[model samples]
Target: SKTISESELSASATELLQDYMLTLRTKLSSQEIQQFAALLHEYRNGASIHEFCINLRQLYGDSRKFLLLGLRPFIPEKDSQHFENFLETIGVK
Candidate 1:
């Protein structure tokens, strides 16, 4: 299964990182990546929004709590409702 493979998440994450880095580099400098990385590490350790979602998803595959608590605010209303319906189909509540 996909969950059994950390590489699956890592590969996607690397792609995301590359895109983010490209954007960041355009607006900032190499030194800023270090600063941002440091802040990201510290913030995650303390409980930033990104940290919360990552923690939730790492614990639950794709459940209601993940959607409601971690994702709802970021999604369109229609997509949020669709996601909830999808979760219900799997009996995830």
Candidate 2:
């Protein structure tokens, strides 16, 4: 419960975006990307990683899908595997 802070999230966000930029540099610039920042801004408060994912899924499903999918491996193995389970729970391929 409440294990992550907005700052931590921001740090991860920055890291992920940088990776994305590099990946894209190697890839639309999609609308989903725009929606992601706005969407993420809504939960600019502390929440457990699990709770955070749930909130995002219910409130805005696919907008942040790219992030989660890519971010799966970014976290620790246990955490990453946990997210993998969560992703399966949500049933998105």
Candidate 3:
């Protein structure tokens, strides 16, 4: 019983992860998708957003760049401010 891993996630969380996978499929490679599958797995189980940000920085290390050059423009509009606050708090520089 010591082999604890990602389990017991609510169906709602599972659905959201799968939906996210589908969206990422258009932009990420198959292996990259699986890596995010693992990343989001831990995220569902209460992983830190700062660590998740580091994960994103490490994983997608210049394979490509999006609209604003970094992950900035990807946060939509309204919550971009909130996301910026989080990034500033975490000192992502």
Candidate 4:
């Protein structure tokens, strides 16, 4: 099994999220890093561990695929109500 530190995961997630922000080709610098850190801190404080896992699961490519597989060893099932309520809020069938 592979393991990554929370700091490493936070930094990776910060870079990924920053990349998705428009204003193409922008680089993340000191101020951006601080802001991203604050944003992630808030997320960690406010979101459940499962919610964090779900976000990781949706990341494209190997990161997500591997994380999901690793999670299977421990997570028996997803919160079906959360999925259903989330879809309902988005008007998804």
Candidate 5:
């Protein structure tokens, strides 16, 4: 079986985020997408990914699974490991 290199995975994740943003551009208002993009960029720059994710869900008044599923493809495995910790912080399951 073949395997993906670390850099390849990293590049793939970046491409996925870009595509996700592109898709969002079509669905959301420019101001909305811009703000969300800024939040995502901050998260990418080392702010709390979990916090931003939770905040997004809260702002949209959506379920945990909805936000998590939407974000799943953009975040890598190691990054997602902290999701449990985030949930605990918020007293969620």
Candidate 6:
């Protein structure tokens, strides 16, 4: 069996992270979506994939809290699990 190197593993993870973010983009509010792009435009504009994930995780420390607090008025009850999964996928602990 072929063993993956650390760099290969990290690259694969980053790719998955990016794909996850794209999926997440579909689940967010339009305003929230725009906010995400604007907040991390540098990354979107090609800064660093890992940096985007790190900054995203940093900014949104708690998935549930962010949904309840940060996105208060805009938060919906129906997509709770969906949003939670998005948060977890993006590294929000």
Winner by TM-score: 5
Which regions of candidate 1 are displaced past 4 Å?
Answer: 1-10, 50-93
lDDT of 1 at 8: 25
TM-score of each: 0.36, 0.44, 0.48, 0.26, 0.59, 0.31
User: Model 2 TM-score?
Assistant: 0.44
Please count the clashing residue pairs in each candidate, in the order shown.
0, 1, 0, 0, 0, 0
Candidate number with the higher TM-score (4 or 5): 5
Q: For residues 18-78, what per-residue lDDT tens digits would candidate 6 score against the true structure?
A: 6646765655666665656665455434544445445555554555234322321121333
Instruction: Please list the C-alpha lDDT of all candidates, in the order they appear.
Output: 0.45, 0.53, 0.52, 0.39, 0.59, 0.46
User: lDDT winner among the candidates?
Assistant: 5
TM-score-better candidate, 1 vs 2: 2
Worst window of 10 by summed lDDT in candidate 4? 67-76
The sequence of per-residue lDDT tens digits that candidate 3 reaches over residues 1-93 is 122223323455456545655766777889987786676566445665456556865675644323112444223343346556655654553
Would you give me the overall lDDT of model 2?
0.53
Model 2, residue 19: C-alpha shift (Å): 3.5
**Candidate 2's residue-wise lDDT over 1-93, tens digit each?**
234543345667668767864663332245545554444444334334576567556544565455456645334443556667788887665
Q: Write the per-residue lDDT of candidate 4 for residues 18-57, one digit (tens) a residue.
A: 5444322243445554554454354445654446444543
The number of residue pairs in model 3 that clash at the backbone is 0
On the 0 to 100 scale, the lDDT of residue 9 in model 5 is 65
Model 2 regions lying over 4 Å from their true place? 1-15, 21-46, 62-67
Error of 6 at 31 (Å): 9.5
Q: Which residue pairs in candidate 2 have backbone atoms (N, alpha carbon, C) closer than 3 angstroms, thus clashing?
A: 24-27
lDDT by residue for model 1 over 5-37, one digit each (tens)? 232235665575566557656644587557555
Q: In model 5, which runs have C-alpha deviations exceeding 4 angstroms? A: 1-9, 63-68, 84-93
After aligning candidate 3 to the native by TM-score, how far in Å is the CA of 7 from where it should be?
A: 18
| Residue 38 Cα positional deviation in candidate 1, in Å, after optimal superposition | 0.8
Q: On a 0 to 1 TM-score scale, where does candidate 5 land against the true structure?
A: 0.59
